[PDB]
Amino acid sequence: KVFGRCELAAAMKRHGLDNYRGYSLGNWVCAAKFESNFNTQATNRNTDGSTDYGILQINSRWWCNDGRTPGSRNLCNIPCSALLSSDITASVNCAKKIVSDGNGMNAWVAWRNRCKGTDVQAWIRGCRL
Ligand SMILES: [Cl-]
Ligand code: NA
């Protein structure tokens, strides 16, 4: 599913992401936009053999199992395929685990290079929240 900007914002807010670990809603919508262009079915393979999945491009090296990333962890306890669902619940729950691990949203390269230090509030501006 390809989310609308406001539609995803409302979805993320409902799942408890607004202000989660101090990150305002705008930060999450911004990350999703530049990681996956709001496409739940986005996948991208990395040089180390791992793959990033879903709206938040969560990595199979640590967070989910895709059966093809030798010696990897599954810290979210889920199949990576579950991160591609139209229902963002799995991705949200796993992202909460990732942002809690100590590096905050810096774990998302796109967020660090394109959202951090920017007016992220612009990503939810005009939305009925
Ligand atoms: Cl932080
Ligand atoms: Na894995």
UniProtKB/Swiss-Prot annotation:
PROSITE patterns: GLYCOSYL_HYDROL_F22_1, GLYCOSYL_HYDROL_F22_2
Residue ranges of every copy of the C-type lysozyme domain listed in the record: 1-129
UniProt GO BP: cell wall macromolecule catabolic process; defense response to bacterium; defense response to Gram-negative bacterium; defense response to Gram-positive bacterium; killing of cells of another organism
CDD domains to which the protein is assigned, alphabetical: LYZ_C
Chemical reaction(s) catalysed: Hydrolysis of (1->4)-beta-linkages between N-acetylmuramic acid and N-acetyl-D-glucosamine residues in a peptidoglycan and between N-acetyl-D-glucosamine residues in chitodextrins
Disulfide bonds: 6-127, 30-115, 64-80, 76-94
Protein origin, superkingdom: Eukaryota
InterPro entries for this protein: Glyco_hydro_22, Glyco_hydro_22_CS, Glyco_hydro_22_lys, Lysozyme-like_dom_sf
First-tier enzyme category under EC: hydrolase
Secreted is among the record's keywords: yes
GO cellular component, one term: cytoplasm
Active-site residue list: 35, 52
Binding-site positions, substrate: 101
Tissues where the protein occurs: In the egg white and polymorphonuclear leukocytes.
Subcellular location: Secreted
Keywords in alphabetical order: Allergen, Antimicrobial, Bacteriolytic enzyme, Disulfide bond, Glycosidase, Hydrolase, Secreted, Signal
Keyword flag Protein biosynthesis: no
SMART domains, alphabetized: LYZ1 (SM00263)
Molecular function GO labels: beta-N-acetylglucosaminidase activity; identical protein binding; lysozyme activity
Record EC number: 3.2.1.17
Record family assignment: Belongs to the glycosyl hydrolase 22 family.
Function, in words: Lysozymes have primarily a bacteriolytic function; those in tissues and body fluids are associated with the monocyte-macrophage system and enhance the activity of immunoagents. Has bacteriolytic activity against M.luteus.
Miscellaneous comment: Lysozyme C is capable of both hydrolysis and transglycosylation; it also shows a slight esterase activity. It acts rapidly on both peptide-substituted and unsubstituted peptidoglycan, and slowly on chitin oligosaccharides.
Protein name listed in UniProt: Lysozyme C
Primary gene name: LYZ
